[PDB]
Amino acid sequence: AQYEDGKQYTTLEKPVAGAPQVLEFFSFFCPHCYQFEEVLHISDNVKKKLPEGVKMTKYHVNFMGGDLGKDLTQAWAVAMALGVEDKVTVPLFEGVQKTQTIRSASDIRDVFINAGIKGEEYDAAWNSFVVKSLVAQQEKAAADVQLRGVPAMFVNGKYQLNPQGMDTSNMDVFVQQYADTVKYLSEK
């Protein structure tokens, strides 16, 4: 076939029921994740090729960056609850990996403030049990699929994208192959 299990994707030995249709995992500490966000715009190109009725989910993970890694998972929960993902993703990536100005939860908080979320609104969210449950959801989704590496994308809880098996000489061609694979898997 043109698409082959073990080539553009792998199949989960343990399929996950009731999983999000397109589920992406990342870490703000993850160097390919930075590329995926700022250079490749993977999420946006996948979306442009997906059908109507397809929701896309993106979760942060704990297993990189120790204590700050966990703060970031909680901050991403805050971003999701407030619907401000698109305002904080770039400055969080840059603060962790480019300027290295994010060293504590307070520094994470500063990113949100500078992005225009009010302190009182941020702190209230940070401490809310709605955000506690969003943190639980992120952890459970990653646990369900035995997740030990990022970036990762899972389609319908049974297929896992395999970017290692795609050409990387041309960045644009890589992104479309990736997005076209997600579409293929989606229609499967």
JSON list of C-alpha atoms in Angstrom, two decimals:
[
{"chain": "A", "resi": 1, "resn": "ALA", "atom": "CA", "xyz": [0.00, 0.00, 0.00]},
{"chain": "A", "resi": 2, "resn": "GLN", "atom": "CA", "xyz": [0.97, 3.68, -0.18]},
{"chain": "A", "resi": 3, "resn": "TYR", "atom": "CA", "xyz": [0.18, 4.09, 3.51]},
{"chain": "A", "resi": 4, "resn": "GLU", "atom": "CA", "xyz": [1.58, 1.18, 5.53]},
{"chain": "A", "resi": 5, "resn": "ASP", "atom": "CA", "xyz": [1.29, 0.37, 9.21]},
{"chain": "A", "resi": 6, "resn": "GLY", "atom": "CA", "xyz": [4.77, 0.77, 10.68]},
{"chain": "A", "resi": 7, "resn": "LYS", "atom": "CA", "xyz": [5.61, 3.41, 8.05]},
{"chain": "A", "resi": 8, "resn": "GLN", "atom": "CA", "xyz": [3.61, 6.69, 8.23]},
{"chain": "A", "resi": 9, "resn": "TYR", "atom": "CA", "xyz": [1.86, 5.50, 11.30]},
{"chain": "A", "resi": 10, "resn": "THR", "atom": "CA", "xyz": [1.76, 2.70, 13.83]},
{"chain": "A", "resi": 11, "resn": "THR", "atom": "CA", "xyz": [-1.26, 0.95, 15.26]},
{"chain": "A", "resi": 12, "resn": "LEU", "atom": "CA", "xyz": [-1.84, 0.76, 18.98]},
{"chain": "A", "resi": 13, "resn": "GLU", "atom": "CA", "xyz": [-1.66, -2.74, 20.46]},
{"chain": "A", "resi": 14, "resn": "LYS", "atom": "CA", "xyz": [-4.02, -1.27, 23.05]},
{"chain": "A", "resi": 15, "resn": "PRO", "atom": "CA", "xyz": [-6.67, 0.79, 21.23]},
{"chain": "A", "resi": 16, "resn": "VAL", "atom": "CA", "xyz": [-8.21, 3.61, 23.32]},
{"chain": "A", "resi": 17, "resn": "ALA", "atom": "CA", "xyz": [-12.02, 3.81, 23.39]},
{"chain": "A", "resi": 18, "resn": "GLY", "atom": "CA", "xyz": [-13.86, 7.14, 23.55]},
{"chain": "A", "resi": 19, "resn": "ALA", "atom": "CA", "xyz": [-10.65, 8.92, 22.59]},
{"chain": "A", "resi": 20, "resn": "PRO", "atom": "CA", "xyz": [-10.58, 12.39, 21.00]},
{"chain": "A", "resi": 21, "resn": "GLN", "atom": "CA", "xyz": [-10.66, 12.21, 17.19]},
{"chain": "A", "resi": 22, "resn": "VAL", "atom": "CA", "xyz": [-7.35, 14.00, 16.67]},
{"chain": "A", "resi": 23, "resn": "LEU", "atom": "CA", "xyz": [-5.22, 14.13, 19.81]},
{"chain": "A", "resi": 24, "resn": "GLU", "atom": "CA", "xyz": [-1.83, 15.85, 19.87]},
{"chain": "A", "resi": 25, "resn": "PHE", "atom": "CA", "xyz": [0.68, 15.82, 22.78]},
{"chain": "A", "resi": 26, "resn": "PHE", "atom": "CA", "xyz": [3.43, 18.31, 23.31]},
{"chain": "A", "resi": 27, "resn": "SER", "atom": "CA", "xyz": [5.77, 19.90, 25.85]},
{"chain": "A", "resi": 28, "resn": "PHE", "atom": "CA", "xyz": [7.03, 23.48, 25.96]},
{"chain": "A", "resi": 29, "resn": "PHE", "atom": "CA", "xyz": [10.45, 21.86, 26.71]},
{"chain": "A", "resi": 30, "resn": "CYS", "atom": "CA", "xyz": [10.31, 19.74, 23.54]},
{"chain": "A", "resi": 31, "resn": "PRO", "atom": "CA", "xyz": [12.54, 20.98, 20.68]},
{"chain": "A", "resi": 32, "resn": "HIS", "atom": "CA", "xyz": [10.62, 19.29, 17.80]},
{"chain": "A", "resi": 33, "resn": "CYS", "atom": "CA", "xyz": [7.43, 20.63, 19.37]},
{"chain": "A", "resi": 34, "resn": "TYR", "atom": "CA", "xyz": [8.80, 24.14, 18.95]},
{"chain": "A", "resi": 35, "resn": "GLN", "atom": "CA", "xyz": [9.44, 23.39, 15.26]},
{"chain": "A", "resi": 36, "resn": "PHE", "atom": "CA", "xyz": [5.92, 21.89, 14.98]},
{"chain": "A", "resi": 37, "resn": "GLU", "atom": "CA", "xyz": [4.46, 25.12, 16.34]},
{"chain": "A", "resi": 38, "resn": "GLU", "atom": "CA", "xyz": [6.57, 27.92, 14.92]},
{"chain": "A", "resi": 39, "resn": "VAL", "atom": "CA", "xyz": [8.24, 26.59, 11.76]},
{"chain": "A", "resi": 40, "resn": "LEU", "atom": "CA", "xyz": [5.89, 23.83, 10.49]},
{"chain": "A", "resi": 41, "resn": "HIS", "atom": "CA", "xyz": [2.50, 24.89, 11.90]},
{"chain": "A", "resi": 42, "resn": "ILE", "atom": "CA", "xyz": [1.49, 21.21, 12.00]},
{"chain": "A", "resi": 43, "resn": "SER", "atom": "CA", "xyz": [-1.74, 21.69, 13.92]},
{"chain": "A", "resi": 44, "resn": "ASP", "atom": "CA", "xyz": [-2.95, 24.37, 11.52]},
{"chain": "A", "resi": 45, "resn": "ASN", "atom": "CA", "xyz": [-2.15, 22.37, 8.42]},
{"chain": "A", "resi": 46, "resn": "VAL", "atom": "CA", "xyz": [-3.77, 19.23, 9.77]},
{"chain": "A", "resi": 47, "resn": "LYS", "atom": "CA", "xyz": [-6.92, 21.28, 10.50]},
{"chain": "A", "resi": 48, "resn": "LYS", "atom": "CA", "xyz": [-7.02, 22.68, 6.96]},
{"chain": "A", "resi": 49, "resn": "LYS", "atom": "CA", "xyz": [-7.22, 19.15, 5.58]},
{"chain": "A", "resi": 50, "resn": "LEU", "atom": "CA", "xyz": [-9.65, 17.62, 8.05]},
{"chain": "A", "resi": 51, "resn": "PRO", "atom": "CA", "xyz": [-13.42, 17.17, 7.25]},
{"chain": "A", "resi": 52, "resn": "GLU", "atom": "CA", "xyz": [-16.37, 18.86, 8.96]},
{"chain": "A", "resi": 53, "resn": "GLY", "atom": "CA", "xyz": [-17.19, 17.57, 12.44]},
{"chain": "A", "resi": 54, "resn": "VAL", "atom": "CA", "xyz": [-13.61, 16.94, 13.47]},
{"chain": "A", "resi": 55, "resn": "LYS", "atom": "CA", "xyz": [-12.43, 18.41, 16.72]},
{"chain": "A", "resi": 56, "resn": "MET", "atom": "CA", "xyz": [-8.73, 18.68, 17.43]},
{"chain": "A", "resi": 57, "resn": "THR", "atom": "CA", "xyz": [-7.36, 18.31, 20.94]},
{"chain": "A", "resi": 58, "resn": "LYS", "atom": "CA", "xyz": [-3.91, 19.33, 22.19]},
{"chain": "A", "resi": 59, "resn": "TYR", "atom": "CA", "xyz": [-2.52, 18.41, 25.62]},
{"chain": "A", "resi": 60, "resn": "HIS", "atom": "CA", "xyz": [0.67, 19.27, 27.50]},
{"chain": "A", "resi": 61, "resn": "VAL", "atom": "CA", "xyz": [2.73, 16.55, 29.21]},
{"chain": "A", "resi": 62, "resn": "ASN", "atom": "CA", "xyz": [4.61, 16.30, 32.51]},
{"chain": "A", "resi": 63, "resn": "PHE", "atom": "CA", "xyz": [7.57, 14.07, 31.71]},
{"chain": "A", "resi": 64, "resn": "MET", "atom": "CA", "xyz": [9.87, 16.83, 30.51]},
{"chain": "A", "resi": 65, "resn": "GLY", "atom": "CA", "xyz": [11.28, 19.62, 32.62]},
{"chain": "A", "resi": 66, "resn": "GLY", "atom": "CA", "xyz": [10.54, 18.32, 36.13]},
{"chain": "A", "resi": 67, "resn": "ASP", "atom": "CA", "xyz": [8.78, 20.75, 38.42]},
{"chain": "A", "resi": 68, "resn": "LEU", "atom": "CA", "xyz": [8.42, 23.42, 35.73]},
{"chain": "A", "resi": 69, "resn": "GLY", "atom": "CA", "xyz": [7.09, 20.77, 33.36]},
{"chain": "A", "resi": 70, "resn": "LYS", "atom": "CA", "xyz": [4.17, 20.21, 35.72]},
{"chain": "A", "resi": 71, "resn": "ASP", "atom": "CA", "xyz": [3.57, 23.93, 36.15]},
{"chain": "A", "resi": 72, "resn": "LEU", "atom": "CA", "xyz": [3.34, 24.15, 32.38]},
{"chain": "A", "resi": 73, "resn": "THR", "atom": "CA", "xyz": [0.73, 21.37, 32.22]},
{"chain": "A", "resi": 74, "resn": "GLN", "atom": "CA", "xyz": [-1.31, 23.32, 34.80]},
{"chain": "A", "resi": 75, "resn": "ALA", "atom": "CA", "xyz": [-0.78, 26.58, 32.82]},
{"chain": "A", "resi": 76, "resn": "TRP", "atom": "CA", "xyz": [-1.90, 24.90, 29.63]},
{"chain": "A", "resi": 77, "resn": "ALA", "atom": "CA", "xyz": [-5.05, 23.82, 31.52]},
{"chain": "A", "resi": 78, "resn": "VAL", "atom": "CA", "xyz": [-5.51, 27.51, 32.37]},
{"chain": "A", "resi": 79, "resn": "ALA", "atom": "CA", "xyz": [-5.03, 28.43, 28.71]},
{"chain": "A", "resi": 80, "resn": "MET", "atom": "CA", "xyz": [-7.64, 25.82, 27.66]},
{"chain": "A", "resi": 81, "resn": "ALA", "atom": "CA", "xyz": [-10.19, 26.93, 30.28]},
{"chain": "A", "resi": 82, "resn": "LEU", "atom": "CA", "xyz": [-9.85, 30.60, 29.29]},
{"chain": "A", "resi": 83, "resn": "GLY", "atom": "CA", "xyz": [-9.61, 29.82, 25.59]},
{"chain": "A", "resi": 84, "resn": "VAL", "atom": "CA", "xyz": [-6.34, 31.68, 25.24]},
{"chain": "A", "resi": 85, "resn": "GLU", "atom": "CA", "xyz": [-4.12, 28.98, 23.70]},
{"chain": "A", "resi": 86, "resn": "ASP", "atom": "CA", "xyz": [-3.43, 31.05, 20.61]},
{"chain": "A", "resi": 87, "resn": "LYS", "atom": "CA", "xyz": [-2.17, 33.98, 22.65]},
{"chain": "A", "resi": 88, "resn": "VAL", "atom": "CA", "xyz": [0.22, 32.15, 24.94]},
{"chain": "A", "resi": 89, "resn": "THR", "atom": "CA", "xyz": [1.65, 29.28, 22.88]},
{"chain": "A", "resi": 90, "resn": "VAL", "atom": "CA", "xyz": [4.35, 31.26, 21.11]},
{"chain": "A", "resi": 91, "resn": "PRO", "atom": "CA", "xyz": [5.57, 33.29, 24.14]},
{"chain": "A", "resi": 92, "resn": "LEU", "atom": "CA", "xyz": [5.67, 30.15, 26.27]},
{"chain": "A", "resi": 93, "resn": "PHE", "atom": "CA", "xyz": [7.72, 28.25, 23.69]},
{"chain": "A", "resi": 94, "resn": "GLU", "atom": "CA", "xyz": [10.06, 31.24, 23.25]},
{"chain": "A", "resi": 95, "resn": "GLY", "atom": "CA", "xyz": [10.35, 31.87, 26.99]},
{"chain": "A", "resi": 96, "resn": "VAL", "atom": "CA", "xyz": [11.30, 28.26, 27.64]},
{"chain": "A", "resi": 97, "resn": "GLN", "atom": "CA", "xyz": [13.51, 27.50, 24.61]},
{"chain": "A", "resi": 98, "resn": "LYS", "atom": "CA", "xyz": [14.65, 30.80, 23.02]},
{"chain": "A", "resi": 99, "resn": "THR", "atom": "CA", "xyz": [15.07, 33.50, 25.67]},
{"chain": "A", "resi": 100, "resn": "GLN", "atom": "CA", "xyz": [15.03, 31.09, 28.61]},
{"chain": "A", "resi": 101, "resn": "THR", "atom": "CA", "xyz": [13.19, 33.64, 30.70]},
{"chain": "A", "resi": 102, "resn": "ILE", "atom": "CA", "xyz": [10.69, 31.16, 32.08]},
{"chain": "A", "resi": 103, "resn": "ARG", "atom": "CA", "xyz": [12.17, 29.65, 35.23]},
{"chain": "A", "resi": 104, "resn": "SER", "atom": "CA", "xyz": [9.27, 29.58, 37.71]},
{"chain": "A", "resi": 105, "resn": "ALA", "atom": "CA", "xyz": [5.48, 29.53, 37.86]},
{"chain": "A", "resi": 106, "resn": "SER", "atom": "CA", "xyz": [5.63, 33.30, 38.33]},
{"chain": "A", "resi": 107, "resn": "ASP", "atom": "CA", "xyz": [7.44, 33.66, 35.01]},
{"chain": "A", "resi": 108, "resn": "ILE", "atom": "CA", "xyz": [4.75, 31.55, 33.33]},
{"chain": "A", "resi": 109, "resn": "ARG", "atom": "CA", "xyz": [2.15, 33.82, 34.87]},
{"chain": "A", "resi": 110, "resn": "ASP", "atom": "CA", "xyz": [3.96, 36.89, 33.43]},
{"chain": "A", "resi": 111, "resn": "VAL", "atom": "CA", "xyz": [3.49, 35.50, 29.92]},
{"chain": "A", "resi": 112, "resn": "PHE", "atom": "CA", "xyz": [-0.28, 35.43, 30.42]},
{"chain": "A", "resi": 113, "resn": "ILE", "atom": "CA", "xyz": [-0.32, 38.96, 31.92]},
{"chain": "A", "resi": 114, "resn": "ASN", "atom": "CA", "xyz": [1.67, 40.33, 29.00]},
{"chain": "A", "resi": 115, "resn": "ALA", "atom": "CA", "xyz": [-0.78, 38.55, 26.70]},
{"chain": "A", "resi": 116, "resn": "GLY", "atom": "CA", "xyz": [-3.60, 40.51, 28.34]},
{"chain": "A", "resi": 117, "resn": "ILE", "atom": "CA", "xyz": [-5.17, 38.03, 30.74]},
{"chain": "A", "resi": 118, "resn": "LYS", "atom": "CA", "xyz": [-5.82, 39.76, 34.05]},
{"chain": "A", "resi": 119, "resn": "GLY", "atom": "CA", "xyz": [-3.92, 38.58, 37.12]},
{"chain": "A", "resi": 120, "resn": "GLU", "atom": "CA", "xyz": [-7.07, 38.07, 39.09]},
{"chain": "A", "resi": 121, "resn": "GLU", "atom": "CA", "xyz": [-8.52, 36.07, 36.18]},
{"chain": "A", "resi": 122, "resn": "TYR", "atom": "CA", "xyz": [-5.37, 33.96, 35.85]},
{"chain": "A", "resi": 123, "resn": "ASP", "atom": "CA", "xyz": [-4.94, 33.22, 39.57]},
{"chain": "A", "resi": 124, "resn": "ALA", "atom": "CA", "xyz": [-8.60, 32.35, 39.93]},
{"chain": "A", "resi": 125, "resn": "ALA", "atom": "CA", "xyz": [-8.32, 29.93, 37.02]},
{"chain": "A", "resi": 126, "resn": "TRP", "atom": "CA", "xyz": [-4.96, 28.52, 38.25]},
{"chain": "A", "resi": 127, "resn": "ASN", "atom": "CA", "xyz": [-6.60, 27.56, 41.55]},
{"chain": "A", "resi": 128, "resn": "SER", "atom": "CA", "xyz": [-9.95, 26.37, 40.16]},
{"chain": "A", "resi": 129, "resn": "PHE", "atom": "CA", "xyz": [-11.15, 22.73, 40.28]},
{"chain": "A", "resi": 130, "resn": "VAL", "atom": "CA", "xyz": [-12.19, 23.12, 36.67]},
{"chain": "A", "resi": 131, "resn": "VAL", "atom": "CA", "xyz": [-8.48, 23.51, 35.89]},
{"chain": "A", "resi": 132, "resn": "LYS", "atom": "CA", "xyz": [-7.70, 20.64, 38.31]},
{"chain": "A", "resi": 133, "resn": "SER", "atom": "CA", "xyz": [-9.95, 18.43, 36.23]},
{"chain": "A", "resi": 134, "resn": "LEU", "atom": "CA", "xyz": [-8.38, 19.66, 32.98]},
{"chain": "A", "resi": 135, "resn": "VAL", "atom": "CA", "xyz": [-4.98, 18.71, 34.36]},
{"chain": "A", "resi": 136, "resn": "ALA", "atom": "CA", "xyz": [-6.45, 15.27, 35.19]},
{"chain": "A", "resi": 137, "resn": "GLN", "atom": "CA", "xyz": [-7.72, 14.91, 31.62]},
{"chain": "A", "resi": 138, "resn": "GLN", "atom": "CA", "xyz": [-4.32, 15.73, 30.16]},
{"chain": "A", "resi": 139, "resn": "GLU", "atom": "CA", "xyz": [-2.63, 13.22, 32.41]},
{"chain": "A", "resi": 140, "resn": "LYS", "atom": "CA", "xyz": [-5.19, 10.49, 31.74]},
{"chain": "A", "resi": 141, "resn": "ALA", "atom": "CA", "xyz": [-5.06, 10.87, 27.95]},
{"chain": "A", "resi": 142, "resn": "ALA", "atom": "CA", "xyz": [-1.27, 10.49, 27.99]},
{"chain": "A", "resi": 143, "resn": "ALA", "atom": "CA", "xyz": [-1.47, 7.53, 30.40]},
{"chain": "A", "resi": 144, "resn": "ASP", "atom": "CA", "xyz": [-4.02, 5.77, 28.17]},
{"chain": "A", "resi": 145, "resn": "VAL", "atom": "CA", "xyz": [-1.46, 5.57, 25.31]},
{"chain": "A", "resi": 146, "resn": "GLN", "atom": "CA", "xyz": [1.72, 4.81, 27.29]},
{"chain": "A", "resi": 147, "resn": "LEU", "atom": "CA", "xyz": [3.18, 8.13, 26.27]},
{"chain": "A", "resi": 148, "resn": "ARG", "atom": "CA", "xyz": [6.95, 8.44, 26.58]},
{"chain": "A", "resi": 149, "resn": "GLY", "atom": "CA", "xyz": [7.68, 10.88, 23.77]},
{"chain": "A", "resi": 150, "resn": "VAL", "atom": "CA", "xyz": [6.54, 14.12, 22.17]},
{"chain": "A", "resi": 151, "resn": "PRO", "atom": "CA", "xyz": [5.42, 15.54, 19.76]},
{"chain": "A", "resi": 152, "resn": "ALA", "atom": "CA", "xyz": [2.81, 12.83, 19.35]},
{"chain": "A", "resi": 153, "resn": "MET", "atom": "CA", "xyz": [-0.42, 12.61, 17.46]},
{"chain": "A", "resi": 154, "resn": "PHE", "atom": "CA", "xyz": [-3.06, 9.92, 17.81]},
{"chain": "A", "resi": 155, "resn": "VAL", "atom": "CA", "xyz": [-6.05, 9.50, 15.53]},
{"chain": "A", "resi": 156, "resn": "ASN", "atom": "CA", "xyz": [-9.27, 8.01, 16.98]},
{"chain": "A", "resi": 157, "resn": "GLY", "atom": "CA", "xyz": [-7.36, 6.39, 19.81]},
{"chain": "A", "resi": 158, "resn": "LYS", "atom": "CA", "xyz": [-5.95, 3.67, 17.54]},
{"chain": "A", "resi": 159, "resn": "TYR", "atom": "CA", "xyz": [-3.36, 5.17, 15.17]},
{"chain": "A", "resi": 160, "resn": "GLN", "atom": "CA", "xyz": [-0.15, 7.02, 16.04]},
{"chain": "A", "resi": 161, "resn": "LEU", "atom": "CA", "xyz": [1.59, 9.26, 13.50]},
{"chain": "A", "resi": 162, "resn": "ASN", "atom": "CA", "xyz": [5.13, 8.22, 12.59]},
{"chain": "A", "resi": 163, "resn": "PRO", "atom": "CA", "xyz": [6.97, 11.33, 11.33]},
{"chain": "A", "resi": 164, "resn": "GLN", "atom": "CA", "xyz": [10.36, 9.54, 11.36]},
{"chain": "A", "resi": 165, "resn": "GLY", "atom": "CA", "xyz": [9.17, 7.74, 8.24]},
{"chain": "A", "resi": 166, "resn": "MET", "atom": "CA", "xyz": [8.48, 10.83, 6.08]},
{"chain": "A", "resi": 167, "resn": "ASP", "atom": "CA", "xyz": [10.93, 12.80, 3.85]},
{"chain": "A", "resi": 168, "resn": "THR", "atom": "CA", "xyz": [12.46, 15.84, 5.62]},
{"chain": "A", "resi": 169, "resn": "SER", "atom": "CA", "xyz": [14.52, 17.42, 2.82]},
{"chain": "A", "resi": 170, "resn": "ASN", "atom": "CA", "xyz": [11.70, 19.86, 2.17]},
{"chain": "A", "resi": 171, "resn": "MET", "atom": "CA", "xyz": [9.78, 21.23, 5.13]},
{"chain": "A", "resi": 172, "resn": "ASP", "atom": "CA", "xyz": [6.58, 22.00, 3.17]},
{"chain": "A", "resi": 173, "resn": "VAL", "atom": "CA", "xyz": [6.46, 18.49, 1.67]},
{"chain": "A", "resi": 174, "resn": "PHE", "atom": "CA", "xyz": [6.90, 17.00, 5.13]},
{"chain": "A", "resi": 175, "resn": "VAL", "atom": "CA", "xyz": [4.00, 18.96, 6.57]},
{"chain": "A", "resi": 176, "resn": "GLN", "atom": "CA", "xyz": [1.60, 17.92, 3.79]},
{"chain": "A", "resi": 177, "resn": "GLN", "atom": "CA", "xyz": [2.59, 14.29, 4.06]},
{"chain": "A", "resi": 178, "resn": "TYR", "atom": "CA", "xyz": [1.93, 14.54, 7.76]},
{"chain": "A", "resi": 179, "resn": "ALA", "atom": "CA", "xyz": [-1.42, 16.27, 7.27]},
{"chain": "A", "resi": 180, "resn": "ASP", "atom": "CA", "xyz": [-2.46, 13.96, 4.41]},
{"chain": "A", "resi": 181, "resn": "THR", "atom": "CA", "xyz": [-1.63, 10.98, 6.63]},
{"chain": "A", "resi": 182, "resn": "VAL", "atom": "CA", "xyz": [-3.85, 12.31, 9.40]},
{"chain": "A", "resi": 183, "resn": "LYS", "atom": "CA", "xyz": [-6.66, 12.72, 6.83]},
{"chain": "A", "resi": 184, "resn": "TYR", "atom": "CA", "xyz": [-6.15, 9.17, 5.55]},
{"chain": "A", "resi": 185, "resn": "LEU", "atom": "CA", "xyz": [-6.20, 7.75, 9.09]},
{"chain": "A", "resi": 186, "resn": "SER", "atom": "CA", "xyz": [-9.23, 9.86, 9.91]},
{"chain": "A", "resi": 187, "resn": "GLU", "atom": "CA", "xyz": [-11.19, 8.37, 6.98]},
{"chain": "A", "resi": 188, "resn": "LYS", "atom": "CA", "xyz": [-10.10, 4.86, 7.96]}
]
